[PDB]
Each structure stands twice: as C-alpha cells, then as structure tokens.
C-alpha cells in the first residue's frame, strides 16, 4: 500500500534498496505482503524464536550420496506435429505411426489446473513455513477409520507428503517429507535453513524432513523410513518405471490380505510417499521441460501407469487423486482410437499394440462409454495366442503387452452389466487356454521373488475355478534355494487373486452361469460359438445334456453340461448321464482346420483337469497333432474334444 526503503550493511558500506509495492502488487495479484508480514513474528524476542527453532527436528545424519538423473522425456522426433492441449483439434495427428508431441506449457496448465493452500496452518508447519497458495495436485488417503491420514500435495516443482496420526486422544502427530529441486523449495519462515532439515541431497534435488522432535520420536516406534534409498529411487528412476514399481507393490499386496486392514508399519507408510512421488515425477518432468514439446509416446506410457496406479490405490485404500488429468491428452488419445480397427489390432506391431492400448485407457478412462476397447484387447490376446507355443509360460514381452491390454477388460468385469458379452467371453476363454501347469509355475516363481512374472497372468482373468491351494502346491517351484515360505505365501496370494467371492472380477457376466445350481462345485467354463460348456462336479446343472467322463473311485465327479445358445433348461436332464463316444479312426496328419472352434481338454482321472486348448487356427491344431501332446501311455489321462455342436468326444487313439 506504499513504498519501503531497505538499508543494510555490506562489507562496511551503507547500501540501501527500495522495494515498491504499488507496482509489484499489481504485477502479481496473488501477492499479499500484509499477511506475510503478519505471519512473520517480526516483534518476536530471540527467546521465543530460539525456543521455536529447538522444537523442530534437525537431521544429524546430514549427508547424501551423489546420484545421476536419467533422461526421462526424449528430444522431439523429426517433424513432430506439435499439438496444443488447449487447442486440441481433430486430424492434426493422422495415425499411430505419425510422429506427435504435446507442448509442455499449456499441458502443465491442465495438470495443475486446480489451486489451493499447499501448506496448512497446523501447529507443526506454522513454525517452519510461510502460508502458500499455489496451483497444485494432491493424493490423499486415510486408514484406521480416518485416524491415520496422508496427503501428497505437489506442484510441478516440489512434492510434500504429510503424515498425520490421531492417538485415540486429541493429540495429533505430524511428519512431512518434502522432495524437489533445492532452489524451488518453498519459502522458510524464521531462523531455519534447509541443510539442517535435509535428509538426503544430490545435485539440484533434496529430500527434506519437517517434524517435531517429539513427533519424530513417536513415529520412530513404528515408522523407520530409509530416506536415503527413497531419495535414490525418486531420482535415478524414470517417471514410467518408478510408477510401475509402486504399482507392483500395491497389486501384489492387494491380492494378499495386506490392504483389507492396513497396518501402521514402515512398509505401508513408505509406499504412501512413493505413490506421491509416482505422480509428482510425471508432472515434474512435464513442468521441468519448459516451453518445449513432450513426445506423445512418452505421455501414453507415463499416463497409462498413473491411470492403472490410480485404480489400484482405490480398491486398497480410499485414496483420491485430483489434478493429474489433462483432458487435452484424453481427447487427443480418443481421436486416434477412431483410426484403428479394433477387430484387427493384434495384427499390428507389438510396439504399436502397446502404444495403442495405452492411449485406449488414457483416452477412454472410467470404462462403460466405448465398449469397443475390448475387441482391441481381445484381438491382441488372440494374435498372441496363435503364435505362442502351447502350454508354455508366457514370455516377458508377451506378458507385458497383455498386461497393458488387460486393464480395459478388468474394468468391464467390475460392472454387473454384460458389456458386450461375446468378445469378453472369448478373451477369458483364450486366457483359460494359456493357464497351464507351467504358467502357474512361473507366476508362483514370480510371486516368491517379487519379480514381474507375478504382476499379471492370463490365469487371473480365466474361467478356471478348480485351482485350490493343494492343487497349486503341486505346480509350485520345488527348488530348495527358494524360500519355502515365499512359495507358501505365493500360493496364498495366487489363490487369493482367483477367489470368485469378494473379488467381483471373475464371473456373473456370461449368460450360461445362471444355469448352475451350486457355484462352488464349478471347475471350468468354455464359452464356444453358439454353445458354452459347464464343467463341474455338480449333477444338477440346467443344461441341454450331461456327459460324465470316467473319473475314478475317488474325487467328486466330472460332468460336462453343454448350454446351447446360452439359454438354460427348465430342469437338469434326467436319467443316467451320457457316455463320451471314443474315436480311433482319426489320423495325426491334417491339412485343414477340421477342429477350428472346438476345445480340447486333457484331464487326469485322479488329479482332475490338467491342460486346456482352444483350437483357434490351423497353427494351433498342427501344434497339437504333430507334437507329443497325445500321450496314451498313461491310462489315467484322457483327451476330451468339445464341439460347437454341443457334443463331447474322447480321442482314444490315432492311425
């Protein structure tokens, strides 16, 4: 509201500076030099000031190790078509193969669209920070009945994750971690300097801790973070890779009983911060690129992870994210999905398949609007199933691709409505064909080692409900070097993923499911064209017929109840079940598809179902016949052939 002159002594000279506010306050309408002057206790005796300084925890272990920042966003590709997130117009970008990049400045304007108070007026922060009001995004969550809270408020420059505990009395314990470039850190209030609060530093970045000596002691009873390592991972990793790291932890922890009743331990609280880092690293990289362009492929990969990461944190924790969605990117992605033929997506390059599937989820989030995305995911699994050697464990590259495309399918199963059943049932049938004894063995090996092989497996989305604990124990790795418990825990986790009940993402979308009497006795479902088979130990299945394979004098039963056209019957067929006709007049050499559309099951009399194959093309059939799949030496093994006509047949021998 006036001018002020500021005199000071420099090396013995009476220098003075004039700071105007009429001009400055006009040039930055958000500035209020009165609320800050009133915040700064300018008339505070040194006693009160020094007393405030000793309250705040200081980092005695003041050091950090040198770290190398990776190259996250790449240089603009040759002749990229610079899009504007605000001026998003159709036909700028032509196909998936056309080089594209989104400019950074207005793209950041959409990410950090919202604005609010970053730093609360709470008692621990009031001592250290000036009140701040900036464009921001935040990740928030609460556990223990809202008695333990966390909020990852962040900008394009720095992240601040704040823990707060309520101790069943009125007391509130607070501990906040600040991450970002040192120079861009918020403004400190009193005698404080960041080096006294730094827990890890390297180059331009730093990790600052802000808490009371008392509060630091309280948190140390259950929360001993590795501030050194968390800093290294937050710097040395790329935005996409870091977000996936956090994604695996939560996913592999959600299938377990880890996030149904979360505990206040170091591991859980550590991840809470890593989640905030995951989002910050994306917005930070876009904001730190300045007035340039960000390759579109980078956005597709990075924002796909956050989209998936946003869903996992929703089913485990009640977390919310506000401010990491640029509609301009969502639109631009949607426009490009009108370019691709979803029916033949799998015929594209694996590179462009993953590129397209990423834009699909980012372009069409919150599924239930464009159900054609499943056709694209189904086309990828089918094209991949025809080229994959039967009964083998999925390769690292194929598993990754299917994982990307599997998120769209997963969301539809959440919904109680069918959502274009046919293609959805086909995806699950192919998935059921891929879940062999070796696949399960590879998933469990990946769960016991926390590697990527456990993150996703087509078996999760399969129509196979015969996988019990003792049945998985048989297919688990028997290596003595692997931790016996990690394997025993893998089974508990694996099995926990395919619980039909309290999962909601396995069944009740097919129309042949309501024709069953007892759900827990179902073993496997094969939805074919114009028919779906209900393999179960349940005699009372309201189908068209009822076949009974020769089981044994042991386990419950094996029935095959074909449901024609997915329409139940008034009641279960009466009389002794039919006999499976055997076939010997059938040669091993075939030059045409004569088994397209059928399913070939291989079960053991005692052990039950072992392998499943869906003959989808000539390549699949030739792999069955030519290979050593048909082994009749074992009398307790049989091979059932399920036809689209509704018939079941046993292959007993070949020419």
């Amino acid at each position, epitope marked *: 509201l006036s001018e002020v002159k500021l005199h000071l002594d420099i090396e013995g000279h009476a220098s003075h500076y004039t700071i105007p506010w009429t001009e400055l306050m006009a040039k930055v309408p958000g500035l209020s030099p009165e609320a800050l002057w009133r915040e700064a206790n300018v008339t505070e005796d040194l006693a009160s000031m020094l007393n405030r300084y000793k309250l705040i925890y200081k980092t005695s272990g003041t050091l950090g190790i040198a770290l190398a920042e990776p190259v996250d966003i790449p240089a603009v590709s040759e002749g990229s078509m610079q899009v504007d997130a605000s001026k998003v117009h159709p036909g700028v970008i032509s196909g998936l193969n056309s080089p594209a990049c989104m400019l950074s400045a207005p793209l950041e304007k959409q990410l950090f669209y919202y604005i609010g108070t970053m730093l609360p007026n709470t008692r621990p922060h009031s001592y250290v920070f000036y009140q701040l009001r900036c464009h921001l995004s935040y990740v928030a969550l609460s556990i223990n009945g809202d008695k333990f809270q966390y909020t990852g408020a962040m900008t394009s420059k720095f992240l601040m994750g704040t823990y707060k505990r309520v*101790t*069943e*009395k009125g*007391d509130e314990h607070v501990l906040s971690l600040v991450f970002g470039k040192t120079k861009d850190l918020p403004d400190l209030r009193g005698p404080f300097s960041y080096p006294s609060l730094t827990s890890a530093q390297s180059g331009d970045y730093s990790l600052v801790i802000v808490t009371t000596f008392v509060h630091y*002691a309280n948190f*140390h*009873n*259950y929360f*001993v973070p*590795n501030l050194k*390592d968390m800093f290294s991972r937050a710097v040395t990793m790329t935005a996409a890779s870091y977000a996936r790291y956090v994604l695996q932890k939560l996913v592999l922890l959600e299938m377990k009983g880890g996030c149904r009743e979360p*505990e*206040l*331990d*170091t*591991e*859980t609280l550590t991840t809470m911060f890593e989640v905030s880092v995951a989002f910050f690293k994306v917005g930070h990289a876009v904001g730190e690129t300045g007035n340039g362009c960000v390759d579109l492929r980078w956005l597709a990969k990075s924002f796909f992870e956050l989209t998936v990461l946003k869903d996992i944190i929703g089913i485990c924790y009640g977390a919310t994210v506000k401010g990491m969605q640029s509609y301009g990117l969502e639109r631009l992605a949607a426009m490009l999905m009108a370019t691709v033929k979803m029916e033949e997506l799998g015929h594209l390059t694996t590179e462009k398949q993953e590129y397209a599937l990423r834009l699909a989820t980012v372009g069409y989030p919150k599924a239930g609007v464009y159900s054609g995305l499943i056709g694209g995911a189904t086309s990828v699994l089918l094209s991949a199933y025809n080229r994959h050697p039967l009964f083998q464990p999925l390769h690292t590259v194929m598993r990754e691709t299917l994982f990307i495309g599997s998120h769209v399918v997963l969301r539809e199963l959440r919904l109680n409505v069918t959502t274009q059943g046919p293609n959805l049932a086909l995806y699950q049938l192919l998935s059921t064909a891929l879940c062999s004894a070796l696949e399960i063995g590879e998933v469990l090996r990946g769960l016991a080692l*926390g590697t990527e092989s456990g993150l996703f497996s087509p078996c999760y989305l399969s129509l196979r409900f015969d996988l019990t604990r003792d049945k998985l124990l048989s297919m688990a790795p028997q290596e003595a070097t692997l*931790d*016996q*418990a*990690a394997v025993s*825990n893998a089974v508990d986790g694996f099995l926990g993923r395919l619980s039909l009940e309290r999962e909601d993402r396995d069944a009740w979308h097919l129309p042949a499911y309501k024709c069953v009497d007892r759900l827990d006795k179902v073993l496997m479902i094969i939805p074919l064209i114009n028919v779906t088979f209900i393999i179960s130990s349940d005699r009372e299945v309201r189908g068209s017929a009822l076949y009974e394979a020769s089981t044994t004098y042991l386990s419950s039963s094996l029935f095959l109840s074909p449901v024609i056209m997915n329409k139940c019957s008034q009641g279960a067929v009466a009389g002794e079940p039919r006999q499976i006709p055997k076939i010997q007049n059938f040669t091993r050499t075939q030059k045409s598809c004569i088994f397209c559309g059928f399913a070939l099951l291989s079960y053991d009399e005692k052990e039950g179902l072992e392998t499943t194959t869906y003959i989808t093309s000539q390549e699949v059939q030739n792999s069955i016949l030519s290979s050593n799949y048909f082994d009749f030496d074992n009398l307790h093994v049989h091979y059932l052939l399920l036809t689209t006509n509704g018939t079941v047949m046993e292959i007993a021998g070949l020419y």
Partner: antibody, heavy 116, light 108 residues
Framework: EVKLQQSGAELVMPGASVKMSCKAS????????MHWVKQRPGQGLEWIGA????????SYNQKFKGKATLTVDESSSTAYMQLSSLTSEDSAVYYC?????????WGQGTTLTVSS | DIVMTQSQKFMSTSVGDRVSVTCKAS??????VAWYQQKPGQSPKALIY???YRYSGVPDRFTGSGSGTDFTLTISNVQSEDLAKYFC?????????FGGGTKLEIKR
C-alpha cells in the same frame, strides 16, 4: 538406567488367564512402545504384539489375536499382557521388550507354566 | 508373513578366527534388520540396529552389513565369552518376525 523387571514365574490352571506384568524404570515410560515376545525352550522368538503407552493404541498383528490382550497403566509405569484360555502349548518364556525399533532393552523373562 | 531364514543352526570356530552369520529375508526388508545375542540362561540383548549400526557399549568386534534380502552379522575377534545364539529380526512390516537362531560354538 533402563530396567524392565518381570515376575519370575506364573503358574495357572489350564483354561484360566494370567497377568504377566512388566514394570519399567529409568526413562519416561510413555515415550516408547512395549513389545512382547514368546520363546519356547531352545526354539526361536515369536513376536506377540505391541502397545503404544500413554495412548493405549493396541496393535496385535500376528496369530495371537485372541490369546494376547495388552494393557498399560501410566501411574505404576507398568505394561501388561493377558493370556486367555491357557493351553499346554502356551507354556513358555514371555519377554517384554522396550520398543525404540529395534528393541532397545529386554526384560529378564517370565516363564509361564500351565499344568494343574 | 515374512520369514527370516537363518539356514545354519550351528557354527563352530576357533578362538582367534572370525565368523559370519547369514540371515536371508523372504522379501525386501530394507535396512530395518536387528541382531540380538542370547547367552545361555539370559534374555536376548540388542547388538546392532539398522543392519549395520552398533549399539552403545558393544565392542567394535561386532559389525553389520547388508540391505534388502541378504544380511550378515560380522563377528571379527571371537572370545570365549561370545558363546550364544544370534537371532536376526525384521521390523519393517508387521508382523515383526525373527530368525531361527544360530548357535555359535567354540573349539579348543
């Protein structure tokens, strides 16, 4: 001088319940959690649970959910653990340990015997 | 639950040698590992914290090393008084779980 003194032994009939106190001295009892550990003769150490002093925030995080019941009294600076429906398998040494994360100090141990 | 695997239940060494107790975690545990010494007829006593930091009053003969999955307790200059069982503990995620114990024998 931090001390966690524990009663030498406790003999209780099967099916009944036991007291198992742990009196702390030499420090501010309320500024550190209290953890309980179970050890059978010659075997390993099983972590029963933990309780936050001055808040009574109870955290039983293992298979002793229905066995253990941790309580605290600030006046006497004591931390307790109650076993319910005692069985022969529960007869073992029970340590009370001060929690700085890790366990700074350990009590002398309370041997629990269940026979009649 | 996480299991702390101490494979070697017994280890015998001379008086002037060094010994290395191995602790293998079923998951990534970070630097949150503790080692306790339980001499016969005694309660365990805290030896090292954070998997490498030595408690006050314990001699410089004990040192810790490791991070993530493989942890080792380094006892350099053994003496007759070191006979005891050595446990490793993880306190990074509930439930806090201990190792199987490693009995240190002495030859003479």
């Amino acid at each position: 001088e931090v001390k966690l003194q524990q009663s030498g032994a406790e003999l209780v009939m099967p099916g009944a319940s036991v007291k198992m106190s742990c009196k702390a001295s030499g420090y501010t009892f309320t500024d550190y959690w209290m953890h309980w550990v179970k050890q059978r003769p010659g075997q390993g150490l099983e972590w029963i649970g933990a309780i936050d002093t001055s808040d009574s925030y109870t955290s039983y995080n293992q298979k002793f959910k229905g066995k253990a019941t941790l309580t605290v009294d600030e006046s006497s600076s004591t931390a307790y653990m109650q076993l319910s429906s005692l069985t022969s398998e529960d007869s073992a040494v029970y340590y009370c340990a001060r929690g700085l994360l890790p366990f700074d100090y350990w009590g002398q141990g309370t041997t629990l015997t269940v026979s009649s | 639950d996480i299991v702390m695997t101490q494979s070697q239940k017994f280890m015998s060494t001379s008086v002037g040698d060094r010994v290395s107790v191995t602790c293998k975690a079923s998951q990534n545990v970070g630097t949150n590992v503790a080692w306790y010494q339980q001499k016969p007829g005694q309660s365990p006593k805290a030896l090292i914290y954070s998997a490498s930091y030595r408690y006050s009053g314990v001699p410089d003969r004990f040192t810790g090393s490791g991070s993530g999955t493989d942890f080792t307790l380094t006892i350099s200059n053994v003496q007759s008084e070191d006979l005891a069982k050595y446990f490793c503990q993880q306190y990074n995620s509930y439930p806090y779980t201990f190792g199987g114990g490693t009995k240190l024998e002495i030859k003479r």
